[PDB]
DNA sequence: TGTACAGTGACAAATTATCTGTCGTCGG
DNA sequence: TGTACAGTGACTAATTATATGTCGTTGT
């Protein structure tokens, strides 16, 4: 084991002893002794015994022995121990939960007490906040403790199961989470609809952006699917978004890792993992998260602070002015947000290296050039109902909606796992299990309504709406419904409902591209 | 105007410079001055001119002339005009509405325009901080200001109007608002309800607390009329609350003073203080009325922030525990509270004054003691119903309710001032007017309800829910719709609940 | 740092017994021939009091000098500096600033 | 003149470990 | 070992108003 203590910067008397040791340093004779230990009692005005002892003091210890030495009393409170106890016990007690108290109010449950015991001379306030100094102290240091982080080149992930799995190249582990975005946005016309959500795809060995999906539908397993599928298919972006570089970046993970939404615990994400063959894995706390949490601060700071209708990153902060100053409509948004990523994010230097640009890090990061998945092989990110079975004469029942096809009423009896896509469920995949391999069997269509589309949500209310008038349910019952709703919303002197709304400036987004 | 200056912590080189100014105080002659100028020449290490000049700083500037003067470049930025024009009216710009640009953000516009003009030397980073500075520092003092106070017995409240109150008086300008308490309570069963509303009159010239009113509801210009009858009324509380003094406060202002909140700027409020003789005056900013803002932050450090299930003055200060650790009903936090400022707050200090206390001030402030007033004239209160008119039979109809009255059938095709109560609108009071006056007329009865207590917001819902169950209007048909959706819960109703348990156990 | 870590010529040093000093501050001392170790010093009123030694971590075996550390450090500030706020990375903030500016429909009417 | 409670600089008093004299004791 | 950007001490180079000599000129 090993000790030592240094002296800071001396005082001006521990200088004038210092000069003094030095005139005590040289000498070897013992009349020489006595000459300067008198000459030096002098010097310092003291007594010679006290000369004696500073050198001593000198002789036993370092310079920290001509230095004053600090009182053994100095952090001990000169109040009883019961009081000290008391006014400690008072304040954590008063604390407990969702109680906040105050010194102050300590102080006053201090009197109280002394009032019982009839002490005449309890501690003051001045002396309770002494005694809560060092307790409100330590807190202050805890709450802001900083992580070395990692240093670069190795990196591993902590999951909620408690395995580290590595990351040992590119598109080895993407990660993805949601967050709204801190601007308030408009429709065509000038009106506020909301703050968008924005999702971001991002890869671990990397940190480079892998994709996005900016709009104002609420965080399910539709907008993840609808972000993997922009992350995974190769990126092209028309002369609108004033790009100067290209995102070029492609292909599919071989493990995808999340927070505990429901989003990424869906049945739906699970049936996408095991057709595209990349497990999912859920973190352990947000702090483990790194990778894609910190990047909704870096839009923040560069991007949307800039932005008319900034929403500031909590209530706090929310300018005055924020609803009066909204102007960008989503398609708006999401040409500065591409130009951004592409010509700027992806393009700075990766942080935990210092050498190679993010994109450059995820081009150079590949075993290997990804093989392009054609857009239709994509089709695996259509839902399954686990089973349907083929009624007489080859029906299926979905969503109440009737389907036929053009071989199901051999296969009638059988079950069959219905494929179908949320956006428009007047058609349906139907895939059925042959020698324990599933097999493509047909395309159903909603008898009656092949040349229309409705959206499963759109099928589904209309179908409460049935329910609750009490009428009877059928595809042409269901389709009037659907078609009467839309006709009695253009009876309203706004047209607006907030969906209806949203929902067209969305669509009109998402049909812009091309 | 005067021009005066002086040098202070002189001591670090300018004390030998003292000392050779001290040694040349007198011109002794021609002869020996010049050798005290050279003998100087010593003790600074410098020529006789550097010496004479010396002589010359301190003989015409005094003690600041031994001191070493700043350049005349500090301050200044040597990066050219243009730059820091760019820089400074760019980061204001850019902190323009609802943006908030960095000056970092603003050195990335910096090397922008830089490029544009082929410049070599934009302004480096450091430096772009360092032209922003100053207009950083402005901003952060400039939200820093403190204001004096009151000092003394003389208190001029300033209205919207551009007029002053002169507060003389005990009751001469009371004043009201509302705020949110920060505890969340729970019911009698012990689940979550929600976080009351406090609302406080307060007299002017005592700051005494003159009443409360404390519940789940909504601010209203029912709970304004409810926080008046409070603050105007003979207080009393039973042994339950534990007093060990009295509020001993009460009679009617002479002025009332609020935001405005729709509670205040009200005809129910016009009304009352019509009836009352007081006169509505409306606040100028939220900074003139601190005299009720303020009971509210004393309140969160001397009460709420001790009790348990408090959420902190704001989102980002609530404490993660506060929805699980939850106890006191609204019965327990009324009976705190009150003991509160009963015990506590009004028999502390005045700060205005330091030597009477809330309350001694108010009692000894009173020009003289007021009458009580008796609890039915307090019938001020009731809601009035304008210009309904008699239909023949003798029938007045008022929210789906039809009533019927004593001599009322007498003044069918006439028109009528009703006066009601929301808690119970079973029962209406007919005034009409007659030589320009309204006279007392009946106490017409909702038929065949009687026997039987409505609640205006009562009669309301179940009109909602009749009109949109198809059914037809009537007194029973409005009970029926009543007394199922009472039998059969809601946070609204359940918050009523404990809010009426409250009131059972003020009769 | 959490766990006992200091920052000295950006190599990250783990000292032996220092983790229940995570959020102090230190004062520390070195050998410019060979900073692969450091030694932790406490302050105090008069004095500092040695506390435990701390060893550099994910260098190379080999010795490290003070001047061999100040250069990789210069290498690394060098190469950063080759990505010269490339222009890329400043086209984009006019183009930020002019999508806005453009857009002044906060409050137009007819 | 918005406002009034809790936290914070500035100063004074009682207590105690620490530095100084003076003398006595021991060693060279 | 969460993660990566904006603000910040600590040090250095370019520019300048300023302190120091040295001599010429004038007043005493
Ligand atoms: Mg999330
Ligand atoms: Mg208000």
Not at 97 to 118: D, F, I, W
Not at 156 to 161: G, L, Y
Not at 190 to 206: A, F, H, K, N, Q
Not at 357 to 376: D, H, N, Q, S
């Amino acid at each position: 084991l090993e000790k030592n203590v240094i002296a800071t910067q001396l005082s001006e008397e521990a200088q004038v002893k210092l000069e003094v040791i030095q005139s005590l340093l040289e000498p070897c004779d013992r009349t020489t002794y006595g000459q300067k230990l008198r000459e030096a009692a002098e010097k310092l005005n003291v007594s010679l015994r006290t000369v004696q002892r500073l050198v001593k003091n000198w002789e036993q210890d370092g310079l920290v022995g001509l230095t004053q030495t600090s009182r053994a009393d100095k952090g001990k409170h000169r109040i009883g121990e019961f009081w000290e106890n008391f006014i400690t016990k008072t304040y954590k007690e008063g604390n407990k939960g969702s109680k906040r108290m105050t010194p102050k109010q300590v102080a006053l449950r201090v009197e109280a007490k002394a009032r019982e015991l009839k002490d005449s001379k309890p501690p003051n306030y001045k002396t309770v906040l002494r005694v809560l100094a060092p307790i409100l102290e330590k807190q202050q240091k805890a709450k802001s403790i900083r992580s070395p982080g990692w240093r670069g080149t190795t990196l591993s992930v902590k999951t909620r199961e408690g395995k580290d799995l590595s990351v040992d190249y590119s598109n080895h582990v993407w990660q993805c989470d949601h967050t709204r975005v801190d601007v308030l946005l408009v429709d065509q016309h000038g009106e506020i609809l909301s703050r968008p959500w924005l999702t971001t795809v991002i890869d671990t060995y990397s940190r480079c952006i892998m994709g996005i999906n900016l709009g104002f539908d609420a965080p399910s397993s539709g907008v993840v699917a609808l972000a993997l599928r922009h992350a995974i298919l190769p990126k092209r972006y028309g002369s609108e978004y004033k790009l100067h570089c290209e995102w070029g970046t492609y292909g599919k993970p071989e493990h995808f890792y999340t927070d505990g939404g429901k989003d990424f615990r869906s049945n739906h994400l699970s049936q996408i993992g095991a057709q595209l063959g990349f497990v999912c894995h859920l973190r352990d706390r947000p702090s483990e998260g790194g990778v894609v949490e910190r990047p909704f601060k870096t839009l923040n700071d560069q991007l949307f602070s800039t932005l008319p209708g900034y929403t500031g990153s909590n209530v706090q902060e929310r300018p005055e002015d924020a609803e009066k100053d909204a102007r960008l409509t989503l398609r708006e948004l999401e040409q500065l947000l591409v130009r951004y990523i592409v010509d700027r994010y992806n393009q700075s230097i990766d942080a935990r290296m210092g050498d190679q640009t993010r994109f450059e890090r995820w081009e150079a990061g590949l075993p290997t050039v990804p093989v392009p998945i054609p857009e239709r092989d994509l089709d695996i990110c259509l839902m399954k109902q686990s089973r349907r079975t083929v009624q007489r004469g080859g029906c299926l029942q979905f969503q109440n909606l009737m389907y036929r096809g053009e071989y199901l009423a051999g296969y009638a009896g059988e079950t069959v796992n219905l494929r179908f896509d949320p956006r428009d469920i007047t058609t349906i995949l139907v895939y059925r299990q042959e020698n324990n391999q599933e097999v493509f069997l047909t395309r159903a269509h909603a008898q009656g309504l092949e040349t229309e589309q409705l959206a499963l949500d759109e099928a589904e209310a209309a179908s409460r709406r049935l329910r609750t008038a009490g009428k009877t349910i059928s595809n042409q019952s269901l389709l009037q419904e659907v078609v009467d709703r839309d006709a009695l919303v253009a009876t309203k002197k706004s047209r607006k409902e907030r969906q209806k709304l949203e929902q067209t400036v969305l669509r009109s987004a998402a049909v812009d591209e091309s």
